[PDB]
Each structure stands twice: as structure tokens, then as C-alpha cells.
Write a protein that binds this ligand. Structure first.
Ligand SMILES: *[C@@H]1O[C@H](CO)[C@@H](O[C@@H]2O[C@H](CO)[C@@H](O)[C@H](O)[C@H]2NC(C)=O)[C@H](O)[C@H]1NC(C)=O
Ligand SMILES: *[C@@H]1O[C@H](CO)[C@@H](O[C@@H]2O[C@H](CO)[C@@H](O)[C@H](O)[C@H]2NC(C)=O)[C@H](O)[C@H]1NC(C)=O
Ligand SMILES: *[C@@H]1O[C@H](CO)[C@@H](O[C@@H]2O[C@H](CO)[C@@H](O)[C@H](O)[C@H]2NC(C)=O)[C@H](O)[C@H]1NC(C)=O
Ligand SMILES: *[C@@H]1O[C@H](CO)[C@@H](O[C@@H]2O[C@H](CO)[C@@H](O)[C@H](O)[C@H]2NC(C)=O)[C@H](O)[C@H]1NC(C)=O
Ligand SMILES: *[C@@H]1O[C@H](CO)[C@@H](O)[C@H](O)[C@H]1NC(C)=O
Ligand SMILES: *[C@@H]1O[C@H](CO)[C@@H](O)[C@H](O)[C@H]1NC(C)=O
Ligand SMILES: *[C@@H]1O[C@H](CO)[C@@H](O)[C@H](O)[C@H]1NC(C)=O
Ligand SMILES: *[C@@H]1O[C@H](CO)[C@@H](O)[C@H](O)[C@H]1NC(C)=O
Ligand SMILES: *[C@@H]1O[C@H](CO)[C@@H](O)[C@H](O)[C@H]1NC(C)=O
Ligand SMILES: *[C@@H]1O[C@H](CO)[C@@H](O)[C@H](O)[C@H]1NC(C)=O
Ligand SMILES: *[C@@H]1O[C@H](CO)[C@@H](O)[C@H](O)[C@H]1NC(C)=O
Ligand SMILES: *[C@@H]1O[C@H](CO)[C@@H](O)[C@H](O)[C@H]1NC(C)=O
Lengths: 116, 314, 229, 32
């Protein structure tokens, strides 16, 4: 786990040399031949660069806006092809925000319906 | 209020067979390739499971189309849900959820798509719906209804006329609030309550520890260390000793993967049951005996938990 | 609404036809079973070309090249490799088959409870309230068409747990008391259709002093006009 | 009878509706 150096009497921890799987993140080739490459579980210093928990993503731009997940990367991150168009990375949304108008004397009752 | 705990997912492990068997060895790799595509077959088997672990999580927790927020006014007719609702001052998890979480070589571990924060967000939506829109949000759109009115339907559903709830509404709310405090104390200092989740974690850890420890075995070879063989024997003899280690280590990986596939099959089934329970116990009221614990089922609330889901059955 | 319901149903059937039509992704679940089995078979056969430590993966080359004292050793190397490949294959098939075993049990359960009757189980027969379903034949599996009731437009109503009449508390036999802001009605929860609140709709139990949120209204007795006439 | 059935809608909107007499147990009592 660690070694005490023979001359300095200092202790240094031993980590493995960075490694991990290499994944290609792509839209279907039917609409785009643009790709991004994710180096899983590694630092960007070892390998439009985004460092995340799942690894180093090179090629896609990162944005502030969340979107429903399209093609997942992991650890809260998904990617998509958006406006001209390019591959982007974002924190995934789990759906649109909503609420219930919970007044303590209010009820909603359907007046029409459909059969699906 | 009783607690039922089910596992949902396993650690998304991944194994590099080259690093495991022939790490940093050209001569070993050349011999490993003589055994065909066993690595491809084993790698696909483990990759497939890692994918299924997110499928299991998705089926159990992602049961809403919108994320519903709780009301600004926590007035539910005397019913106190402050221990199961997320705490906004924190990861926005409930008091009970924090208590639950606090009690649980060439190889790597991949992250889940949905981290504890995302699971907590789904859980929040499920409770906000259950409490303020009944089961309508499960069937379709979330339609508001007063909590007491919702309970009146839940009681009628078990053969108890609606007037009983109202005559005893104060008593029922008090019994409920007490029951929530009781589960907090039960889950609290004693970790045995979550043994079912702990067992999944422990079994996976043991499988991994066994696989790594096997690298030190000779399997009939003069040495378990590949580098000692390579620096000691000329190829006509070194290759034989290497094959002995390849066979042993490859058999160990095959055993490991098979064991993971079988354990994963159990989890597959548990996740299906957990998802069924949420749909029929939380997003509606089943009339199934012993499905949502003992007694006649009225309502339930999910809670986020490490590697699984915890259901509170009322 | 029989005319409307029949029209919505007929439209819904056309919609599933178009969804299933040109796009094969809809049936990926059946395609995956076929593909996984094909891959398992292709892998098993390809492994026959592997040496597994032998001088040659071809049994005939060993037999025509080496005398038995050496040929037998090279053959054992291929037997061990090929036998291990079969053992791996069979184990993999048994595990995959176990998944299919479970899926078939679920599919059979669904037909019995979704097609041969109507279950009241949430998310069992798709989303919405289950009415009926129809099975369809499919390659290596079964396709279920689930017909469900889903609420659409909704309206904002005021409610109450009970009506206070003569000091007595009136509760619905079935349904919810609602108000349009001027008048109280009683209706079924899953389809707004307001009725006049009468003694034939409600029942009396308890009183006005014990019901939280009780409101003042008039409960109609269909018998009194008859006694007076 | 009126104690078995309920009234909702009318005779012009029900497909397959038939002509019969619905009995009211109250009328004989009012007359007696
Ligand atoms: C809901 O229950 C919680 C306890 O589980 C209540 O929190 C306590 O409130 C009292 C004041 O009435 C404080 O003195 C305690 O210190 C609080 N306990 C904790 C752990 O914070 C909460 O007030 C109840 N809310 C309602 C509306 O009843
Ligand atoms: C609320 O419901 C009441 C009762 O049906 C409505 O009052 C009726 O309105 C019609 C149309 O003007 C009149 O012909 C009836 O004579 C009224 N009935 C009574 C008892 O007064 C009322 O208009 C509805 N209000 C809203 C906003 O829908
Ligand atoms: C329904 O109306 C009656 C009056 O006819 C209400 O009874 C009065 O309630 C007030 C308190 O708000 C008391 O001070 C009066 O003494 C009560 N009058 C009588 C004769 O008892 C009754 O509270 C109303 N109920 C509702 C739900 O509105
Ligand atoms: C029930 O009987 C009445 C007659 O008492 C029917 O009403 C007539 O229907 C015919 C068409 O078949 C019309 O041409 C007449 O003008 C209607 N008479 C009246 C007074 O409206 C009614 O259609 C019958 N309903 C059923 C289901 O048999
Ligand atoms: C070794 O010698 C160097 C000087 O050349 C000195 O700075 C260092 O502290 C010494 N280390 C030990 C363990 O004595
Ligand atoms: C795929 O390509 C075809 C043309 O070959 C095009 O008509 C179709 O719209 C494309 N699919 C998508 C999603 O763009
Ligand atoms: C990557 O390396 C830098 C140092 O160059 C370090 O500061 C950073 O925290 C590392 N990030 C990860 C994810 O290891
Ligand atoms: C998000 O917005 C902040 C400013 O509020 C900016 O500093 C940051 O770089 C933005 N991040 C991305 C990915 O655009
Ligand atoms: C329900 O909405 C449809 C349009 O989608 C309309 O044609 C139908 O008449 C409406 N039914 C009712 C009862 O409002
Ligand atoms: C019902 O009315 C309230 C205002 O009184 C509004 O805030 C709420 O959003 C409405 N409900 C729906 C479903 O629109
Ligand atoms: C609703 O809450 C208000 C307080 O804001 C209270 O005065 C009223 O009586 C409550 N009504 C019901 C039905 O709980
Ligand atoms: C049954 O079908 C006949 C046509 O053959 C039609 O005249 C009759 O009105 C239908 N009755 C019902 C209840 O649909």
C-alpha cells in the first residue's frame, strides 16, 4: 500500500498507473459521424475536455442546462446531440419539475378521458 | 408501520482479464490468445450484468414522469411525515434515509447512472404524490386531494366505512405519528434491520477478495509470480509454467463470472419484486395478503437505501 | 360516450400499427434473446479453431503427425479446451434459460390476469386503469396490447368530507362531495358527473361536531314531495 | 324497480334501450 523510503524516511503511498476502459459515445451514423471519447475511471492529465466522476470525456462540450437523459455516461451525467449541432455533456434531469396544488379543501376530478 | 427491505442492485464491477492473468507480459498474452475468445465471452457476461444493474434501479425507482415537489405548508390533517420527507437544509434526504445509509490488480468499479442524489429525488416525487394526489399520479396525471379524504378511500378499500376515519381521525393521526417514531428507533442503532442489504454487499466483496487472492496460487506451477517464471526459465519451459497459471487464473475468472451471473439472477428477481411492490403498494393499494407486511393494507411510502429500497408499510 | 370510446379505441389501434411498423426497436426485447443465443453458438463453434496450448487446433493434423505417445497429449489439450468451452456454454444457457423461465411465468400470469379477466394491479397492464387486453403472436414470445382508461381534462373543485343537515353528519355512500362555488354536489371520483345530494346517496353516522371540514348544505329527501302530493 | 336501477341520461342516447315498466314500491304505499 505504501513504502518508507530508505533515504528520506518519508512514506509514499502507492497508487496504480491510471487505466480504464475506453468508450466511444456516438449518435447513430444515420444522422451524424461525430463522436466523443470517454476514458473511464481516469484523469485528463494522464490521457472541449470535461473531467467527471465516471472518467475523462474528450470531444463533447459541457453545459449548465440539464436535460432528460438520452445516452447515459454514469454518475449523474448523460450526453446528447444538440445545437450547428454538436455532442454535449450535462447533468441529467429526472423529468420536468412539477407540484400538486395541495389546498386542504381542494380536489381535482377528471371531466374527460381517453382510451389508449 | 412495518419495514420491508429489498435489494435492487449490485456493484457494477468490471475485470480486465489481461491485466488479471498476463499483466505486463507479452509472452503470457501470446499464450492466453491460444485459448480463443474466452475473455471476450467473460467480459460480455460481466458488462451485460453491469448494464442490468441500472435497468433494475430504473425499474424500481423511476416510476414517475414528472418530479413532484412537496407543498410549502406541511398540513396533512394531523399526520406528521417530517421523518420520511427530504430535509432541504442538507444531499436532500429524509431523517430516516440518513439513518439507513449510515448503517451500510486490473479490476475496476463503474458508477451507477443514478446516484444517491437521483434516487432521493425520485423518492421525493413519489412521496409528494402519495401524500397530496393519492394514486392518481401513478395511473396518470397528479390530481390533488386532501389527505384525510384520501385516507377515507383507503379505509373503504379494506371494508371500513369512511365515517370511521373521521370519528377517529385524531386517534388515527396520533397512532400513525407514533408508529413513525417507532420505526426510527428500530432502524437507529441496530444494523441488523438492514442485514438483507449488507448481505449483498458482503457476498460481492467476498467474491472479489477470493478472485484477487487466487492470483497468489501456484496451480501446479513453480511460482505464482509470472515475473519469476519469465526471468528464470527459457521459453521451452517458461511457457509451460505460464500455461499452468493461465489455466488456474482463467478457471478462477470463469468461476467468478458464473457466480456473479447466478447472484445477479437473484437480484434481478428481487428488483422485479421491489418494482412490483412500489407500483401496487405505493402507487395504489393492493388487497393482497402479506404483500405489504401484516394487516390490511392502506398506504406505503418508499425510502432510499444503499444498494436497494426500503418500504414503510402502513 | 360509446361512440367516442369506440372512436378512440379504433384510433389507438391504428397508432400501435404505425409504432410497430417500420421501426424494429419496438421488438428489441425479442431480438436480444435471439442475438444472445446466436452469439453463444457462434462463440462455441469458433472455439474449435483454438489450440488451447496444442501444436494444432486440428485433430486430424495431430493424428497424422504424431505417434500415439505424443498425439494423445496434444489431443487431451484439445479435449480439455473444447470440453471446458461446452461446460461454459451449457452453464451460460442454463442461466439465460432461467431468465426466460421467469419471463414465461410472468407472461403466462399476465395473460391469465390481463386477458382472461381484468386485474386491478397498478402498472401490471401498462399505465392507466386496466379495462381489457388482447394477446398477439410473436417470434419467440408474446405481445400484449393493453387497453387502459386514462383521465384527460380535469377541473378544479372545492370539497368536504361531509354535509351538515339537521345536526346529523351525512357521508357519501360512494364518491366525493364537491362544489362549483355556488352549490354542492356528489360525484364518482374517476369521472365528474355531479348529482344532487340526497338521502339515497349519503348515509348518516355521527354528527356535525365531530367532522373536521364539514360544511352546511341541504340534503334532499325524494319522499317528502310524495307525501305532500 | 327504482331500488335496483338508477337514472342517468335518457332514452335517446342509449343504443339498444328497450321499453318496459319500472316499478316504484312507494306508489302503492301512498295510495293505501
Ligand atoms: C413532527 O414531529 C417532529 C418530531 O419527530 C417534531 O419535531 C420536534 O418539535 C418540538 C417542538 O414541538 C421540538 O421541541 C423538538 O426538538 C423537535 N424534534 C426534532 C427532532 O427536531 C415536529 O415539530 C412535528 N411537526 C408537526 C407539525 O407536528
Ligand atoms: C353551480 O351549480 C348550480 C346548481 O346547478 C348552478 O345554478 C343553476 O344555474 C342554472 C343556469 O343559470 C339555472 O337555470 C338554475 O336554476 C340554477 N339552479 C339553482 C338551484 O339556482 C350554478 O349556476 C353553478 N355555478 C357555476 C359557476 O357553475
Ligand atoms: C351551520 O349553521 C348553524 C347555524 O344554523 C351553525 O351553528 C352555530 O354555530 C356558531 C359557531 O360558528 C355558534 O356560535 C351558534 O350558537 C350555532 N347555532 C346553533 C343554533 O347552534 C353551524 O356551526 C354551521 N355549521 C357549519 C359547518 O357551517
Ligand atoms: C317506447 O315507446 C314510445 C311510444 O310511447 C316510442 O316513441 C315513439 O317512437 C317513434 C319512432 O319509433 C316516433 O315516431 C314517435 O313519434 C315516438 N312517440 C313519441 C310520443 O315520442 C319510443 O321510441 C319507444 N322506445 C323504445 C326503446 O322502444
Ligand atoms: C542521507 O544523506 C543526506 C546528505 O547527503 C542527508 O540529507 C539525508 O538526511 C540522509 N538520510 C538519512 C536517513 O540519514
Ligand atoms: C435515417 O436516414 C434516413 C435516410 O436514409 C432518413 O430518412 C431518416 O429520417 C433518418 N433517421 C433519423 C432519426 O433522422
Ligand atoms: C487529476 O489530477 C490533478 C493534478 O494534476 C488533480 O488536482 C485532480 O484532483 C485529479 N482529478 C482526479 C479525478 O483524479
Ligand atoms: C455555468 O454558469 C456559470 C456562471 O453562473 C459559469 O461560470 C460556468 O462556467 C457555467 N458552466 C458551464 C458548463 O457553462
Ligand atoms: C373529450 O375530448 C375529445 C377531444 O380529444 C372530444 O372529442 C370529446 O367530445 C370530449 N368528451 C367530453 C365528454 O368532453
Ligand atoms: C387549481 O386552482 C389553483 C388556484 O386556486 C391553482 O393554483 C392550481 O394550479 C389549479 N389546479 C390545476 C390542476 O390547475
Ligand atoms: C384548512 O386550513 C385552514 C388554515 O389555513 C383552516 O382554517 C381550515 O379549517 C382547514 N380546512 C380543512 C378542511 O382542513
Ligand atoms: C343488432 O344488430 C341489428 C342489425 O342486424 C340492429 O338492427 C340492432 O339495432 C342491433 N341491436 C343492438 C343492441 O345493437
Amino acid at each position: 500500500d505504501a513504502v518508507r523510503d530508505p533515504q528520506t524516511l518519508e512514506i509514499l503511498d502507492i497508487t496504480p498507473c491510471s487505466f480504464g476502459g475506453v468508450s466511444v459515445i456516438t449518435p447513430g451514423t444515420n444522422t451524424s459521424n461525430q463522436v466523443a471519447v470517454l476514458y473511464q475511471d481516469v484523469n485528463c492529465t494522464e490521457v472541449n475536455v470535461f473531467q467527471t466522476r465516471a472518467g475523462c470525456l474528450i470531444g463533447a462540450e459541457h453545459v449548465n442546462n440539464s436535460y432528460e437523459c438520452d445516452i447515459p455516461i454514469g454518475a449523474g451525467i448523460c450526453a446528447s446531440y444538440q445545437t450547428s449541432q454538436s455532442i454535449i455533456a450535462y447533468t441529467m434531469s429526472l423529468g420536468a419539475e412539477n407540484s400538486v396544488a395541495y389546498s386542504n379543501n381542494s380536489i381535482a376530478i377528471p371531466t374527460n378521458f381517453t382510451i389508449s | 408501520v412495518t419495514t420491508e427491505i429489498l435489494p435492487v442492485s449490485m456493484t457494477k464491477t468490471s475485470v480486465d482479464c489481461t491485466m488479471y492473468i498476463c499483466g505486463d507480459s507479452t509472452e503470457c498474452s501470446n499464450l492466453l490468445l491460444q485459448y480463443g475468445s474466452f475473455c471476450t465471452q467473460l467480459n460480455r457476461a460481466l458488462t451485460g450484468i453491469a448494464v442490468e444493474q441500472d435497468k433494475n434501479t430504473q425499474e424500481v425507482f423511476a416510476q414517475v414522469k414528472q418530479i413532484y415537489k412537496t407543498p410549502p405548508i406541511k398540513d396533512f390533517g394531523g399526520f406528521n411525515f417530517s421523518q420520511i420527507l427530504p430535509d432541504p437544509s442538507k444531499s436532500k434526504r429524509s431523517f430516516i434515509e440518513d439513518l439507513l445509509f449510515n448503517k451500510v490488480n486490473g479490476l475496476t468499479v463503474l458508477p451507477p447512472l443514478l446516484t444517491d442524489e437521483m434516487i432521493a429525488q425520485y423518492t421525493s416525487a413519489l412521496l409528494a404524490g402519495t401524500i397530496t394526489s393519492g394514486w392518481t399520479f401513478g395511473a396518470g396525471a397528479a390530481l390533488q386531494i386532501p389527505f384525510a379524504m384520501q385516507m377515507a378511500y383507503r379505509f373503504n378499500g379494506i371494508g371500513v366505512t369512511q365515517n370511521v376515519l373521521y370519528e377517529n381521525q385524531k386517534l388515527i393521526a396520533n397512532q400513525f405519528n407514533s408508529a413513525i417514531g417507532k420505526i426510527q428507533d428500530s432502524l437507529s442503532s441496530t444494523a441488523s434491520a438492514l442485514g438483507k442489504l449488507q448481505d449483498v454487499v458482503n457476498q460481492n466483496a467476498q467474491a472479489l477478495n477470493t478472485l484477487v487472492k487466487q492470483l497468489s496460487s501456484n496451480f501446479g506451477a513453480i511460482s505464482s509470480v509470472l515475473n519469476d517464471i519469465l526471468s528464470r526459465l527459457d521459453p521451452p519451459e517458461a511457457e509451460v509454467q505460464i500455461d499452468r497459471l493461465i489455466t488456474g487464473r482463467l478457471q478462477s475468472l470463469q468461476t467468478y463470472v458464473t457466480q456473479q451471473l447466478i447472484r445477479a439472477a437473484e437480484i434481478r428477481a428481487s428488483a422485479n419484486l421491489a418494482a412490483t411492490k412500489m407500483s401496487e403498494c405505493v402507487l395504489g393499494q393492493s388487497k393482497r395478503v402479506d404483500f405489504c407486511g401484516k394487516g390490511y393494507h392502506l398506504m406505503s411510502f418508499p425510502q432510499s437505501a444503499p444498494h436497494g429500497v426500503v418500504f414503510l408499510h402502513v | 360516450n360509446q361512440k367516442l370510446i369506440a372512436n378512440q379505441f379504433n384510433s389507438a389501434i391504428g397508432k400501435i400499427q404505425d409504432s410497430l411498423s417500420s421501426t424494429a426497436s419496438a421488438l428489441g426485447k425479442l431480438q436480444d434473446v435471439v442475438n444472445q443465443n446466436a452469439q453463444a453458438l457462434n462463440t462455441l463453434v469458433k472455439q474449435l479453431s483454438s489450440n488451447f496450448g496444442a501444436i494444432s487446433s486440428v485433430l486430424n493434423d495431430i493424428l497424422s503427425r504424431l505417434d500415439p505417445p505424443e498425439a494423445e497429449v496434444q489431443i487431451d489439450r484439445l479435449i480439455t479446451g473444447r470440453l471446458q468451452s461446452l461446460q461454459t456454454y451449457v452453464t451460460q444457457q442454463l442461466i439465460r434459460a432461467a431468465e426466460i423461465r421467469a419471463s414465461a411465468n410472468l407472461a403466462a400470469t399476465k395473460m391469465s390476469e390481463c386477458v382472461l379477466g381484468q386485474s386491478k394491479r397498478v402498472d401490471f397492464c401498462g399505465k392507466g386503469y386496466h379495462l381489457m387486453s388482447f394477446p398477439q403472436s410473436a417470434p419467440h414470445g408474446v405481445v400484449f396490447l393493453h387497453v387502459t382508461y386514462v383521465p384527460a381534462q380535469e377541473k378544479n373543485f372545492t370539497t368536504a368530507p361531509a354535509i351538515c343537515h339537521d345536526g346529523k353528519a351525512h357521508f357519501p355512500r360512494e364518491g366525493v362531495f364537491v362544489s362549483n362555488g355556488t352549490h354542492w354536489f356528489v360525484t364518482q371520483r374517476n369521472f365528474y358527473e355531479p348529482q344532487i345530494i340526497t338521502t339515497d346517496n349519503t348515509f348518516v353516522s355521527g354528527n356535525c361536531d365531530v367532522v373536521i371540514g364539514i360544511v352546511n348544505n341541504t340534503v334532499y329527501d325524494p319522499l317528502q314531495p310524495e307525501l305532500d302530493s
